[PDB]
Amino acid sequence: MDIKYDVVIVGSGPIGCTYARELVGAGYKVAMFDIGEIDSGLKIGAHKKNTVEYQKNIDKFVNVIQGQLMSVSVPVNTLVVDTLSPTSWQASTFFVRNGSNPEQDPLRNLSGQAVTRVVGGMSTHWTCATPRFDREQRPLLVKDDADADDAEWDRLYTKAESYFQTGTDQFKESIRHNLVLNKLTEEYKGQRDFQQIPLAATRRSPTFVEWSSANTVFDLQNRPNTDAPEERFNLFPAVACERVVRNALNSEIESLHIHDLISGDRFEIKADVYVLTAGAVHNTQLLVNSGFGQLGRPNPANPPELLPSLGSYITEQSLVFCQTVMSTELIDSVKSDMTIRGTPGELTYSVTYTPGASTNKHPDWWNEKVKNHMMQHQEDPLPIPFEDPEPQVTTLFQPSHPWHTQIHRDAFSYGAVQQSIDSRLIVDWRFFGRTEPKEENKLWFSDKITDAYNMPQPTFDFRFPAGRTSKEAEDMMTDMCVMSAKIGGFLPGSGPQFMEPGLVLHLGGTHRMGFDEKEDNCCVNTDSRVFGFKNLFLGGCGNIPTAYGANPTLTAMSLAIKSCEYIKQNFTPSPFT
C-alpha cells in the first residue's frame, strides 16, 4: 500500500473486475478497494455455489444468499406485541429501534432492495443469467444510425459474453430441460421462441457446473506475479471508500478518501482515473457524500448544482413468481418409447427400447438414461433419472410479450410439505417486467440518519408508475398463469404472486447514462464519464436509463468495456519502473 496509482476502482463486483481486466491488461497501475472481505475460498471473488457440497445440496444455497443480503431501508416497525409479561420493559411509542430508518415511508419503499459487501459482490451468489437486451430495452450508443448502434452493441456484448463465459449448451442433455423446452416450443409454434437461458457457466462434468462470477472476469490476484510479471494490480479488502474530492472548478477529481476498517487508518489515495463500481445504491451514496446532487429530502425549490438527475428516474423490475408440479401427461411422455413387461421389483421386470427406430419420439441418449433409471431403481415411480439436471428455459423479451422469463430451478426454501413433493417434478417460474423511468421515483440520503458504516442512510421514494408499466405487470402475471399451465399445476403454497418490491435486485437508473446532461436527464455520457469531470467514471446498473425486463449485468458490463476504451484513448499508463 502506497497512495499513488494510475487507476483506482471502488468495488470488486463483476463491473469493477471488467475495468480491472481491461486496464490491468493494458498496462495501468491499478488499485481496487472493497469494503468487504475475501470469503469464497482461494479463487478470490469466485461463485460460492461451486463447492461440491452445494452442487449436491442446492436448496441450502438460499441460506448463503440470505446471509449476505442486507436490506437497504427498513421502515420503523409498528407491530403490536401485547402478550409481554407485565414485568418486561416496554416503550410507549414505536421508537427508532434495530437499525430502522425513520425517513422511510413504508408505503413508498423498495423493501426488498438489499446490498452485499463481499469481495466479488453479488456475483458470488447470483443466478448467472446473461441475456442481451433487444432494442426496446437498450440504451442508444449511436444516434440516428440503428444499424451502427446494433453493430456497436454486438461487439461489446460478444466481448462481455467471453469474459463471463456465457453459453446456451450447459443443460442440453437434461431430460427435464428438454421436456419443458419441447412442450413450450410446441404450444407456442409460430408465436414465440424458446431456448436455454444464456448462462455464465461452464459444465465440467454431468454433475458439476462451474458458475461464473467476478473471478471469471478477473482473477483478483495481486500483480506482478509469475503468470503476469508485467502487470500491476493491488486489491485492498475491508476498505470503505468514503468520498471523492472534487476540485473547486468541478472539472476533476483530486483524490479518494478511504477508511481501512481493520487498521482504522484513513488515507487520501491519488490516481489519474477514478472508477466507481460500488453498486447502484452505493455509487450514489458515495457521490452524494462527495457533494454531488444533494443530501436530505429532495426539494425542487432548491435543485442541486451538480448532477440534478442523480438518484431520480430509478427503476426496479416487477417480478411475478410461482412453482408448478409437472403434469401426468408430461411425465408419461418421458417413457413413451419404452416397452414395459412384468411387474416392478420382481424377477424379470424388463424395460427396453429399440435404438434408431424413427417411431422413437426421443433420442437415444434420453431413452438409455430412462431405461437404466427404471431398470436400476425399480422401486422409484418416476422415469426421470435422479441426477438429471434442472430445466433452464427462456422465451426472451419481445414487444408482444415485454417481459423476461426464467423457467427453471434455482436456490429455494421449501416448506415441509413442498419437501413432500419429488424435486424432479418442480419447475420455478420467474417473469420480470420493465419499469418506466419517472423523475419522481427516487433514492435519497438522510442528512440526519446514518447506516451501519456511518454513511448517510439511503431512503426510497418509489411507486410502480401508472400506465404502461402497471398494465404490463398485470399482463405478465396472466401470461405466467397461462404459460405455466401447459407444464403442470401450481405447487400449493407457491402459487402466482408478486414478489416484494426490489427483491429482484436489478435496481437501475440511479446515475443514468445519456447523450446530454440536461436534455436526457442524466449523470454520465456514453463513456460512463460523469458530466463536467475529466477523470471520473461510474459503472453498473445505475447507468442504465431505459425500462428493462431482462437481467442487466451483461449490459452494464458491455457499457464498462466501452468506458475502458475511452480511458485507454485518453490516459497514459505510468512506465513500469
Add this chain to the structure above:
Amino acid sequence: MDIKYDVVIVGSGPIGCTYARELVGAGYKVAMFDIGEIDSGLKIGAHKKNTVEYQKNIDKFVNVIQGQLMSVSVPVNTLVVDTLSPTSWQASTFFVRNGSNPEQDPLRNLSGQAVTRVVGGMSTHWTCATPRFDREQRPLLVKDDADADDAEWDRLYTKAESYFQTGTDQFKESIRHNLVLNKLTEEYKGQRDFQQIPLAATRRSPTFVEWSSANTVFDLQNRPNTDAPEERFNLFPAVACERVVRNALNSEIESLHIHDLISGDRFEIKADVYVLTAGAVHNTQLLVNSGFGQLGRPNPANPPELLPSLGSYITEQSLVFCQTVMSTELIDSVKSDMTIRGTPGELTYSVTYTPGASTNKHPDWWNEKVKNHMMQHQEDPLPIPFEDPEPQVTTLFQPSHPWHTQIHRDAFSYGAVQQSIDSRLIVDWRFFGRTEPKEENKLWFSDKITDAYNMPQPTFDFRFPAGRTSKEAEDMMTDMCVMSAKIGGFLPGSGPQFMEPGLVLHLGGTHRMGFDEKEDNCCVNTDSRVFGFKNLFLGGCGNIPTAYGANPTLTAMSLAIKSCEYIKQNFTPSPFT
C-alpha cells in the same frame, strides 16, 4: 500429491488440527484430507463470523450456519398435499424421495443432527463456548487415583485452552452482561456461582471480537514455508476418505483409500499413523465402511467381530431454550446513579453522576457509558449504549443443578415482531442436560441406502433414557423458567421449549473411550487408540463415554493432546530432505 506420509489425518476440524499442531510441530511429515473445501477467506479454516459485516449484522449469521448444516437422517415424508391440480403427477404412496432415509423410524430419530463439510469443520461457525467438565461429567484417565486424574485433566485442559485462546474476560465491561450477572449473583447468593461463559475468543476492539476456530489451533498452511521452514504439512481439500484398509490380523491399518472429488481419481495413501477426526457420525461411518462393527440393522444374534460397541451408547444433550425481554426494574436500575433534570431534546436536559461516589450502585466506566448515551441520544428511551456487547453468562454444571447454562445472545432469526422489540432488551437462555449412555441408543448404517457421497446411510435408533436423564431434563426446564423470570418475562413466540433432538449437535459416545474394550464397552483406549490396532487413532466427541451437559469440544481436544503424547513416544518422524 505423493503417497507416503508419517501421519495422515482425516478431517480438518479443531480436533484434526490439534493433532496437526502437535505432530507437525514435533517434526512429522503430515497430510490432512477434508471432503469439504476452503471457503472462510485467506485464513484457512477461520471463523466465518470474523468479518466486519457479521460483527455489524450478527443476526444474518444464522443463515451461514444453516447453509452448512446438512441433516444426517431424514425419515420418509408423509405430509399429505391434496390441493394439487388434477393434471399434476401424483404418486399413490409416500415413496422414498428427496434424499430421505426409509430405514429411519421417525419416532426414534435425532432429527436435528446435522454435519458440516468444509475446511475447519463446524469451528467455522460454532459459538466458541469452552468449559471444562467437572468430575461427574468427565471420563477417567487415571484409575484409582482421583488426584492424579485431576492433575492430568488440568494439565490437558490448560494446553487446550491455550490452543483455542479461551478466556473469561472478553465481555467484562458490557453493561448488559454485568446487569444480568450481578442480578443472578444476587438472587442465587450462597447457592450458585455465576461467571462469564469461557469463550475461545480474543477481543480486538470495543466492536470486534475475533472468535477462535480450527485456524487458531493450526493455521493450515502447507509447509515447508517461510515462517516454518523445517515443518512438513499438506492439506488436501475436496477429498473423500472412504476406507481404512485393515490387515488380515486386524492389528494394523495398511492404507487410506481416498477419492478426489474434483479430478474423480482414487488413490491409496500410506502412513505410519492414521488419525480419524471426521466427526462423531463420519468417523463411525468410515470405520463401518472399513469393516469395523457391522453394516445393517443391528442384531445381537450376530454381534460383530470388531468393535462390537461401535455406534452404541450414543448420547445427545437435551436442550431447552427461551428468550426474555428485560424487566423494567433492571432497565431502570442501569441509570440508578444518574441525576436527570430538564427535558430531553432541549437545552435544559442534564444527565449527571458523581464519579467515585460510594453510594453509586455502579462503577464509573458504566456510568460514563450510560451518561454519554443518554446525553448524546436524547430521543432514545433506553439507558443502554447502542453498541453495548451482549451478555455472556453462565452458572456451570453442578450436582444440585446438573445442566450447563448459557445466558447470552448468539445468531438468531427474529420473526417480524421479535424485530419489534429492541434488541438491547433481549436475552437467549440455553440449558443443556446430560444423557445417560445406553446400549440400545445406536447410530447404524444401511446396507442398501446410500448418502450423497455414496456411502452407507446413517440411521439413528435413539430415545432419551427413562429415569434420571428424563427426570433431569424436566427439572432443567423448570429451572430455566424460574431463573429467567428474575431477568424479565418471555418474549412471545420464544417461550420455553425443548429444541429438536440433536439440533444441539453435541453427539457423543459413537466410538467411546475406556480402559478395557469388553469391561467398559468401548472402542478406543485412553490414548484414543483403537483396540487391537497399533496405528489407528480416533479423535472427537465420539470418544467421550460419559453423560455430559457442558459443551464438549475442549474435552475432546484434551483427549487429542494426550493421544498425541502417546504418538510422539511411539512413532519416529521421517528425516527431512
Add this chain to the structure above:
Amino acid sequence: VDWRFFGRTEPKEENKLWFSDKITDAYNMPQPTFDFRFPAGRTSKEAEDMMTDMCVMSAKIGGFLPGSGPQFMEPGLVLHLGGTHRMGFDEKEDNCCVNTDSRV
C-alpha cells in the same frame, strides 16, 4: 372480491363411499371411508382450464390479494357431494339406485 370457479367431475365406478365393518363413527354407526381421485381425462383437463380462466378473468377486475392467490381447495370442502345413491331409468343399464320418482 372473492372468486370461486366450480368444475364438473365425471362419474366413475371406482370412485366410492364405503363403510367400515369394524370402525364406527361418533354415533356408533359404520365409519364412512372414501376411495376417490379426480378422473383422468376431461375432468382433470377442465379443472386446469378452469384455473387459467379464473386467472385471466380475475385480472380484468384487479390483482390478487396476497395470501389468497389462485389455488385449488381441499377436495370436498365444496360440499356438493353427489351420485352416492344415483338416479337413472334402469338399475342395471344406468348403474343406479333410484328411478326418476326417486323410488328405490
Add this chain to the structure above:
Amino acid sequence: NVIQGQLMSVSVPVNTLVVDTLSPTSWQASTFFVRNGSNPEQDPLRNLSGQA
C-alpha cells in the same frame, strides 16, 4: 366461525405428524396409533378430506 362450528369431517386419516420436541418425561407412543377419532381405513391419498 358459525359455519366451521357445525361442520364435522366425515373421514380423517390416522395422523402421522412427528412431534419430537416433547419433554422426555411426557408419555409418547411408539407408533402412529388410531387416536382422536381418526379412520384407520382411510388412505390419506384417496380421500375427500374437506368433506363434512
